[PDB]
Amino acid sequence: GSMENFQKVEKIGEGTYGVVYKARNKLTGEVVALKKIRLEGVPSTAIREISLLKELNHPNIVKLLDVIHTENKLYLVFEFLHQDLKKFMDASALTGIPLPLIKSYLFQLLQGLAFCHSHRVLHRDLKPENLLINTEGAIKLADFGLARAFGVPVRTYTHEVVTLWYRAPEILLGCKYYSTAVDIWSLGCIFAEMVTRRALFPGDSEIDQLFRIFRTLGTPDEVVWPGVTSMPDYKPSFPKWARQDFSKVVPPLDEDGRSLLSQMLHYDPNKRISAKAALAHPFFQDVTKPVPHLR
Amino acid sequence: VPDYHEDIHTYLREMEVKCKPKVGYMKKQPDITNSMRAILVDWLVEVGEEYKLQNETLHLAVNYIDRFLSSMSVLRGKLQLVGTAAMLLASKFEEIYPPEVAEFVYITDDTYTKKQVLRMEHLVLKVLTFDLAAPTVNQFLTQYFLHQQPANCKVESLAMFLGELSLIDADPYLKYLPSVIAGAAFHLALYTVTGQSWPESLIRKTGYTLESLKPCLMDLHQTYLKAPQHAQQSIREKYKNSKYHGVSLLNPPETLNL
Ligand SMILES: Nc1ncnc2c1ncn2[C@@H]1O[C@H](COP(=O)(O)OP(=O)(O)OP(=O)(O)O)[C@@H](O)[C@H]1O
Ligand SMILES: [Mg+2]
Ligand SMILES: [Mg+2]
């Protein structure tokens, strides 16, 4: 694998190192995404992204095909997926995304994530931009640029993780230890977003983010979440909102869907459902794989 | 405990076989020796102390070096450069705030330039094909610690100390898998501090018994006994600190009663 065999088609993304191009393999015909990384040496984010991606082979995780590693440039060759979930939701602006597709996408995401967690990888930036969809009804986790290999038990990792809207309360409240549960929180926010077609908790600051969560799920106390009031960024001044009826959080969602969402958004990371356990939720009893109704 | 504890252990057991360096590589190395390797690893321990790096970072760096040297002949005047690039790579992989490249150039006493470190980083990555997520003794120990009844800080620190000592001596420790070394280190720590043994919940978890651990355990025991007389002393110094409950001051048992 080398750059002569590839023909750039168009730019399909802007990163940080940092330009993603659609390209065609001239000999095989394979369509690929080329992620260029400009070369303090090789950035830690690329080091982790490549090492972790090489270990993760799963139908719901983006495939890293090759690494083209020269003097001044590092090229990551990925399988090309047509669109990301964020753009897809924008194109379905009016009149929504069918429940069967949402269910299928969530089922697939949980598969991808459980595989990650089973191979000791935290993703730490799950959001709709970073999830990729193809024309056959597949969705895949992408952008492992914030990922890390975790230990059992975890120690303290980077604090500044997960983009704000999808960031779990244990991160916001400054817990010394976070783990797989943070990726589940993000997925719960995305589930809600696919149903309502707007972000669940769109804060503009950390405190704003916490308060939005509190108004929806209730202000956490020692009953719902043991230890919470001892957490570094917990304040006794926090307003005390009542938890709201979940049928009002995501009105189009029926009883099984509400049940699953509530388990993904549990305050206590210990009680928050795992990706593995969630695959067996009754919400998925009738799951199929519809093709995305759009392009 | 969580989900994934069993899945993760199983996966690390698969990957430790795949990430294992070649047992006899030193014989094929024309210009470097086990002794020179011991001096490099000991220096890395010091570097880890100076920049307050995780123990995991150290274990990773040593894994990268042993794998690199499994296929690349290296001259004695270049060993430290391989080591420095490896510690840089380990740091970027594992540390929240790794030291800057300039700082790695600094700790080599101007032996090498910045460009040399950066070019060696590239070469190490090529040789390892970017496969940096390797299981370590340390990663096994933290899982085994969860089987303590009850938890004991002295047992944990001593096991870490003994696991670290094994990094120094390629003979005999290159022939043992990290999960095995961790097994031996944990039994030896447990026995030294509390008189307890390898617990049967770990037999269920690992499939290892004291019988299967014995070859590694006899080596580790001798290493522990001989520790104060070893040419390399940075680990013993390190583990005098209250950070590790001064476990390097505990007295090794005279016999293992096996
Ligand atoms: N394999 C792929 N197939 C199709 N599109 C892709 C692929 N990989 C990335 N993209 C597009 O490029 C965008 C950026 O890539 P990615 O998220 O992997 O890296 P990033 O540098 O973190 O990007 P950003 O800074 O925009 O989040 C993605 O959101 C996606 O829309
Ligand atoms: Mg992205
Ligand atoms: Mg030799």
* 3-state SS string for chain A: CCHHHEEEEEEEEECCCEEEEEEEECCCCCEEEEEEEECCCCCHHHHHHHHHHHHCCCCCECCEEEEEECCCEEEEEEECCCEEHHHHHHHCCCCCCCHHHHHHHHHHHHHHHHHHHHCCEECCCCCHHHEEECCCCCEEECCHHHCEECCCCCCCCCCCCCCHHHCCHHHHCCCCCCCCHHHHHHHHHHHHHHHHCCCCCCCCCHHHHHHHHHHHHCCCCCCCCCCHHHCCCCCCCCCCCCCCCHHHHCCCCCHHHHHHHHHHCCCCCCCCCCHHHHCCCHHHCCCCCCCCCCC
The answer to whether B69 and B174 are in contact (CB under 8 A) is no
Q: How do beta strands A148-149 and A121-122 pair? A: antiparallel
Q: What residues of A are in contact with residue B14 (Cβ under 8 Å)?
A: none
Cα separation of A257 and A274, whole Å? 16
Name the residue among A241, A172, A242, A228 with its Cα closest to residue A205: A172
User: Considering only alpha carbons, which residue of chain B is nearest residue A181?
Assistant: B2
CA–CA distance, A66 with A209 (Å, rounded to integer): 39
Strands A139-141 and A131-133, sheet pairing = antiparallel
Cα-only R_g, chain A: 20
Q: A114 CB less than 6 Å from ligand 1?
A: no
- Give the residue extent of every domain in chain B: 7-20+134-258, 21-133
Residue nearest to atom 13 of ligand 1 (CA): A13
B6 Cα distance to chain centroid: 23
Dist. CA A102–CA A115, nearest whole Å? 20
Query: For residues A221 and A225, what is the distance between their CA atoms, to the nearest angstrom?
Result: 6
Between helix B153-168 and helix B137-144 the angle, nearest 10°, is 160
Q: Report the nearest atom of ligand 1 relative to the CA of A14.
A: 26
Contacting residues of A for B1, CB less than 8 Å apart: 153
- Tokens 């000791």: give the residue: A120
Count of residues for chain B? 258
Q: State the method.
A: X-ray
CA A163 vs. chain centroid, Å, equals 10
| Pair B59, B98: CB distance under 8 Å | no
Resolution in A: 2.1
Tell me whether B7 touches chain A (CB under 8 Å): yes
Q: What structural domains and CATH numbers belong to chain A? A: 3-82 (3.30.200.20), 83-295 (1.10.510.10)
- Helix A44-55 and helix B79-94: axis angle, to 10°? 80
Give A221-228 contacts, CB < 8 A, sequence gap 24+: A224/A267, A224/A268, A225/A267, A225/A268, A226/A268, A228/A173, A228/A267
Q: Does the C-beta of A185 come closer than 6 Å to ligand 1?
A: no
Q: Count CB atoms within 10 A of the CB of residue B35.
A: 14
Whether B199 contacts B157, CB under 8 Å: no
- Alpha-carbon distance of B79 to A74, in angstroms, equals 26
CA neighbours closer than 13 Å in the CB half-sphere of residue B224: 30
Cβ contacts of B245 within 8 Å, gap of 6 or more: B153, B154, B157
Count of beta carbons in the 10 Å neighbourhood of residue B77: 11
Nearest to B130 among A50, A155, A156 (CB): A50
For the beta carbon of residue A169, count every other beta carbon within 10 angstroms. Answer: 26
Architecture of domain B7-20+134-258: Orthogonal Bundle (1.10)
Catalytic-residue membership of A245: no
d(CA A117, CA A114): 5
Rounded to whole angstroms, the Cα distance separating A17 from A36 reads 7
Q: Do B7-20+134-258 and B21-133 come out as alike in CATH topology? A: yes
Is A53 exposed, middle or buried, given 0-12, 13-18 or 19+ CB atoms closer than 10 A? buried
What are the distances in angstroms from CA A293 to CA A99, A226, B22?
Answer: 12, 44, 53
Neighbouring C-beta atoms of residue B164, cutoff 10 Å: 25
Closest Cβ opposite residue B132 in set A51, A69, A158: A51
Nearest partner of A188 among A199, A174, A176, A179, judged by Cα: A199
Residue type, A10: E
Q: Say how far apart CA A292 and CA A1 lie, in whole Å.
A: 32
First to last CA, chain B: 32
Ligand 1, closest atom to CA A16? Answer: 21
Whether the upstream peptide bond of residue B24 has omega within 30° of 0, thus cis, is: no
Report residue A192: phi and psi, to 5°: -55, -45
Q: How far is CA A26 from CA A30, A76, A194, B125, in A?
A: 8, 17, 37, 28
User: A143-156: string of b/e by CB count within 10 Å (b at 16+)?
Assistant: bbbbbbbbbbebee
- Cα(A11)–Cα(A256) distance, rounded to whole angstroms? 41
Q: What is the 3-state secondary structure (H, E, C) of chain B?
A: CCCCHHHHHHHHHHHHHHCCCCCCHHHHCCCCCHHHHHHHHHHHHHHHHHCCCCHHHHHHHHHHHHHHCCCCCCCHHHHHHHHHHHHHHHHHHHCCCCCCHHHHHHCCCCCCCHHHHHHHHHHHHHHCCCCCCCCCHHHHHHHHHHHCCCCCHHHHHHHHHHHHHHHHCHHHHCCCCHHHHHHHHHHHHHHHHHCCCCCHHHHHHHCCCHHHHHHHHHHHHHHHHHHHHCCCCHHHHHCCCHHHCCHHHCCCCCCCCC
Where is chain A discontinuous (C–N over 2.5 Å), named by the preceding residue? 39
Size of interface A-B (CB pairs under 8 A): 87
Q: For residue B33, give both structure tokens.
A: 């020796």
Q: Which of B44, B89, B47 is nearest to B64 (CA)?
A: B89
What single letter denotes the amino acid at residue B232? Q
Residue type, B89: L
> CB B133 to CB A149 under 8 A?
yes
Q: What CA–CA distance (Å, rounded) separates A111 from A106?
A: 9
User: Which protein residues have a CB closer than 5 Å to ligand 2 (ion)?
Assistant: A 130, 143
Task: State if residue A125 touches ligand 1 by the CB under 6 angstroms criterion.
Answer: no
Q: Which two tokens stand for residue A12?
A: 């399909």
Buried/exposed code over B227-245 (b: 16+ C-beta within 10 A; e: otherwise): beeeebebbbebbeeeebb
A47 at interface of B, judged by CB pairs closer than 8 A = yes
In sequence order, the 6+-apart residues with CB closer than 8 A to the CB of B146 are: A152, A153, B1, B5
A31 phi and psi angles, rounded to 5 deg: -85, 130
Q: Between chains, do A47 and B3 touch, taking CB under 8 Å as contact?
A: no
Q: Which amino acid is at B242?
A: S
> Exposed e or buried b for every residue in B179-214, given b needs 16+ CB within 10 A?
bbbbbbbbbbbbbbbeeeebbeebeebbebeeeebe
* A78 touches ligand 1 (CB under 6 Å): yes
Asked if the C-beta of B231 comes within 8 angstroms of chain A's C-beta atoms, the answer is no
Q: How far is B124 from chain A (nearest CA, A)?
A: 11
Which residues of chain B are within 8 Å of residue A41 when distances are taken between CB atoms? 88, 101, 117-118, 121-122
According to the CATH classification, is domain B21-133 in 3.40.50.10540? no
CA-CA distance, B178 to B191, in Å (whole number)? 20
Give the closest residue to B185 by CA, choosing from B241, B137, B252: B137
Point out the residue among A48, A117, A276 whose CB comes nearest to the CB of B93.
Answer: A48
Q: How many CB atoms lie within 10 A of CB A111?
A: 20
**Residues within 8 A of B (CB atoms), A 220-259 only:** none
